Amino acid sequence: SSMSYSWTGALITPCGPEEEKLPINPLSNSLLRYHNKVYCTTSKSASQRAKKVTFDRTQVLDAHYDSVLKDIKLAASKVSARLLTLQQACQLTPPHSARSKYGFGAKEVRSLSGRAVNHIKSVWKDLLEDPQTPIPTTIMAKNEVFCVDPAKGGKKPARLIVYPDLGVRVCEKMALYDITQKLPQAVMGASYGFQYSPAQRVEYLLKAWAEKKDPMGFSYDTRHFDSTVTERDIRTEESIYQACSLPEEARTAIHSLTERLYVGGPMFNSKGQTCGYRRCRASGVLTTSMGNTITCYVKALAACKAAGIVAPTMLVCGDDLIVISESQGTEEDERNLRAFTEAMTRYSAPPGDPPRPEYDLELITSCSSNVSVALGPRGRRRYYLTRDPTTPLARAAWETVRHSPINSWLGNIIQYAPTIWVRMVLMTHFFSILMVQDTLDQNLGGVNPLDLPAIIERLHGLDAFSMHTYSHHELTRVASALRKLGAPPLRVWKSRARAVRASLISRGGKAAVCGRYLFNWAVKTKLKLTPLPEA
RNA sequence: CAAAUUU
RNA sequence: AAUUU
Ligand SMILES: Nc1nc2c(ncn2[C@@H]2O[C@H](COP(=O)(O)OP(=O)(O)O)[C@@H](O)[C@H]2O)c(=O)[nH]1
Ligand SMILES: [Cl-]
Ligand SMILES: [Mn+2]
Ligand SMILES: [Mn+2]
Ligand SMILES: [Mn+2]
């Protein structure tokens, strides 16, 4: 039936300047050599993304879907959800959020300037009074950094971001924010992925795995998921929102937003020209995450039922899921996954790479990450979250006139503190840099480098300073990644850490704390590492 | 552009 | 600020 997009032929213009690296990368030319492999998805490449995502869609539901959808509405109704005062919504706008066409930006909105507050009042009026006129949207390309992958086709084209003017975004929040805070958790229960910390995510997966008499696992991702979302899915999304206790004024707004924005509409490039028209998810609206997550969860749980997966235990984060099930033999498991996939494909949620059953937790990737295991200080198996380091490393070498990567070094050091690649590579580099800059005190993205041990033990457990004997998979993947980016191998980072460490220790103070906890892995005579006041 | 987590 | 979807 419905085509996902249609194109005037007008280009998808840049919303500013997209910078190139420079001939010297002073912060990261000691981290890695192959800077030619590090690129940022440009808006010229948007054209190609459009081609990939524009395609005709056909959807066939069935008892299993219908049934799941029923049960989900019954969940939805145990939820009461209130409107948000125009002001409260203004306050939830991000600091730098892209300004309005109508002469004002996020400063005004967050501070409750009167020009801003009136415009918004009017815009909300128009939603209440008018429930069909489509709402224009801007379309732009997302700029992300990756390592090239010649094996997987050279350079990814830029993903497409599609969003309404600022005023509309506030209104969206008024109508929907509270729902987003309550509905998913209530529809999906323990399956709701974003609810968990990474540690809980891991415990959850292990508990699921443990529960089975004979576990089988897989993950599923949808190809260009936002393109796969149909007018009907969105309307079914509305009817799920509506299934709550709502102020009548909300219902009108929801329904008006649904019909005028969410379900489709015209798109304009940043120079103002009509770009095309959209009949699927706009990734840019408030409902993007919740939408994707709920919808994905319906189709998924239906496919599970269509395919006979026994005792499924799910975890959904957007279009990404993991199911851990009771195995029915490999022969049947393969048949069921095929079924599952046909069902999803019928429901208009077809796979990128088609899924496969696995019987070992390490072999299941979702949200670009996976569980692995190493040994801790006393010889116990310690499970943790990790990932291919390619992209984080690539991003660690993204230096331009207007951008420093030091923050991403830190971001990843915190998030993946127990991973061998953070511990040996990223930390070593990060500290090495700052000691030489002599800018350790300096706060970065509101964090103090010298806190790190505390920060890390709070979030990952003191075991993160003592883990050893990492998995074959993980060593292979790390090695291979450094080799791919022309970084030094681990043996060299070992040396460099001994040095960094010695300097940090001899620096005294918190530096020495850092030097001792964070680099204890680097020494043959490893110390007794006890817990920290600060956490 | 939106959300979630981490800070 | 970082990351993810
Ligand atoms: N608003 C917004 N949504 C995103 C972004 N990245 C991913 N998503 C949403 O999550 C969906 C699934 O993500 P992913 O599997 O990573 O990409 P895709 O399936 O190729 O589109 C996308 O189709 C988007 O709707 C982003 O930067 N902004
Ligand atoms: Cl242990
Ligand atoms: Mn996907
Ligand atoms: Mn309605
Ligand atoms: Mn995904």
Side-chain angles (χ1 to χ4, degrees), chain A residues 1-43 45-50 53-69 71-73 75-77 79-106 108-114 116-124 126-131 133-151 153-202 204-206 208-212 214-270 272-330 332-352 354-377 379 381 383-401 403-440 443-457 459-493 495-523 527 529-533 535:
Chain A
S1 342
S2 33
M3 212 61 181
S4 63
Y5 295 93
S6 345
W7 309 93
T8 70
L11 273 161
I12 296 170
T13 49
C15 296
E18 308 155 323
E19 306 193 319
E20 234 82 296
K21 279 142 80 60
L22 304 200
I24 299 183
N25 309 99
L27 298 163
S28 59
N29 59 15
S30 52
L31 182 57
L32 62 86
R33 306 208 339 272
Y34 304 163
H35 295 266
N36 50 319
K37 296 211 204 193
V38 171
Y39 73 100
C40 188
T41 67
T42 203
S43 76
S45 90
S47 307
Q48 299 152 242
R49 176 84 184 169
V53 299
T54 309
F55 80 97
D56 186 277
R57 290 157 305 147
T58 46
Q59 174 165 225
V60 183
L61 308 189
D62 53 71
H64 296 124
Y65 183 105
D66 296 319
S67 166
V68 160
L69 181 44
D71 295 285
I72 274 184
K73 294 177 161 166
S77 49
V79 164
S80 66
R82 57 83 155 189
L83 276 151
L84 228 67
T85 79
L86 173 153
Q87 302 97 47
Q88 293 173 321
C90 291
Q91 318 299 38
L92 294 167
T93 292
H96 300 311
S97 189
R99 62 186 298 93
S100 180
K101 263 177 190 128
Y102 300 85
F104 69 89
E108 292 78 7
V109 170
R110 291 159 63 73
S111 66
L112 301 177
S113 106
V117 171
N118 273 331
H119 188 285
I120 293 172
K121 277 171 178 158
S122 100
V123 168
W124 182 254
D126 182 297
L127 283 186
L128 288 187
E129 285 164 300
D130 172 353
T133 331
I135 309 184
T137 49
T138 303
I139 184 177
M140 68 180 188
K142 189 165 159 212
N143 300 118
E144 342 197 40
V145 161
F146 295 111
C147 178
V148 300
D149 184 11
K155 274 182 206 195
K156 295 193 225 293
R159 145 187 318 288
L160 295 167
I161 300 301
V162 165
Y163 66 98
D165 181 83
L166 174 48
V168 178
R169 305 206 291 276
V170 187
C171 291
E172 280 186 77
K173 299 198 175 74
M174 294 164 60
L176 283 151
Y177 192 81
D178 195 32
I179 280 163
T180 75
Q181 302 291 280
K182 285 178 201 161
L183 176 53
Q185 311 75 343
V187 170
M188 301 162 59
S191 292
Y192 185 57
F194 297 122
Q195 103 189 249
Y196 298 105
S197 61
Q200 293 162 309
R201 189 141 72 245
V202 176
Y204 180 76
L205 287 170
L206 289 171
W209 199 271
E211 280 178 37
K212 307 320 180 191
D214 211 83
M216 186 283 289
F218 68 100
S219 63
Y220 190 99
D221 184 83
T222 303
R223 188 180 192 261
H224 308 323
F225 177 101
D226 59 8
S227 290
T228 87
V229 177
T230 55
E231 283 117 326
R232 191 170 161 179
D233 285 315
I234 293 161
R235 293 182 166 118
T236 310
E237 266 156 12
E238 184 196 333
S239 59
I240 294 159
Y241 304 149
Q242 295 295 2
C244 300
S245 250
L246 303 177
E248 290 294 317
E249 196 191 352
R251 307 196 178 281
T252 314
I254 316 296
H255 176 72
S256 183
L257 282 164
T258 295
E259 289 301 326
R260 299 183 61 184
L261 181 56
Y262 295 167
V263 103
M267 303 185 304
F268 295 83
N269 65 346
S270 64
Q273 296 128 241
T274 314
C275 206
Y277 193 103
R278 155 188 64 92
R279 273 173 294 261
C280 64
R281 174 83 70 214
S283 292
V285 308
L286 182 74
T287 42
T288 308
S289 285
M290 170 175 69
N292 291 359
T293 296
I294 289 172
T295 279
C296 167
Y297 174 83
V298 178
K299 292 178 187 177
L301 187 45
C304 281
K305 278 159 81 73
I309 277 86
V310 169
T313 297
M314 289 191 60
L315 213 58
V316 195
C317 285
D319 85 325
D320 276 63
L321 54 147
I322 287 172
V323 189
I324 292 162
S325 151
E326 286 282 13
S327 186
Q328 306 298 116
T330 74
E332 218 222 291
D333 294 350
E334 305 284 331
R335 227 138 49 225
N336 303 355
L337 243 68
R338 249 131 55 208
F340 182 95
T341 313
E342 291 161 4
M344 297 287 306
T345 300
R346 280 194 311 278
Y347 308 158
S348 187
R356 190 168 78 178
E358 296 297 1
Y359 307 79
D360 177 292
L361 195 46
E362 210 190 2
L363 267 22
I364 290 173
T365 288
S366 210
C367 305
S368 312
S369 61
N370 75 274
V371 183
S372 207
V373 54
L375 302 173
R381 309 266 177 308
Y383 298 89
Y384 66 98
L385 211 82
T386 187
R387 57 169 304 172
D388 193 313
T390 293
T391 302
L393 287 174
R395 288 176 185 176
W398 187 256
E399 305 181 54
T400 70
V401 168
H403 181 275
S404 170
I406 310 230
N407 284 328
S408 99
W409 306 351
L410 195 59
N412 287 123
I413 288 162
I414 289 156
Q415 185 170 12
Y416 289 112
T419 67
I420 189 169
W421 58 272
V422 157
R423 293 178 73 208
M424 294 185 56
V425 178
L426 265 182
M427 283 176 169
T428 309
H429 187 65
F430 171 87
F431 274 103
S432 171
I433 281 304
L434 295 170
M435 275 194 301
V436 170
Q437 290 196 350
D438 202 53
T439 62
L440 284 176
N443 279 42
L444 305 171
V447 167
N448 189 302
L450 298 142
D451 293 353
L452 278 170
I455 318 195
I456 275 161
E457 115 163 309
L459 173 59
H460 289 282
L462 198 85
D463 286 337
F465 308 125
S466 271
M467 274 151 54
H468 61 97
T469 311
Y470 286 86
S471 83
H472 176 66
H473 263 83
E474 199 50 17
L475 298 174
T476 318
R477 188 163 59 176
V478 169
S480 157
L482 296 169
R483 199 169 47 242
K484 178 153 98 283
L485 290 156
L490 292 186
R491 61 187 177 75
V492 163
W493 291 101
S495 318
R496 297 207 192 168
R498 282 197 271 275
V500 162
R501 177 174 194 273
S503 172
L504 273 180
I505 269 170
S506 79
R507 192 147 304 200
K510 312 187 81 188
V513 170
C514 281
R516 217 128 39 194
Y517 281 57
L518 306 185
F519 299 91
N520 220 44
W521 63 266
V523 308
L527 319 199
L529 276 167
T530 42
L532 296 171

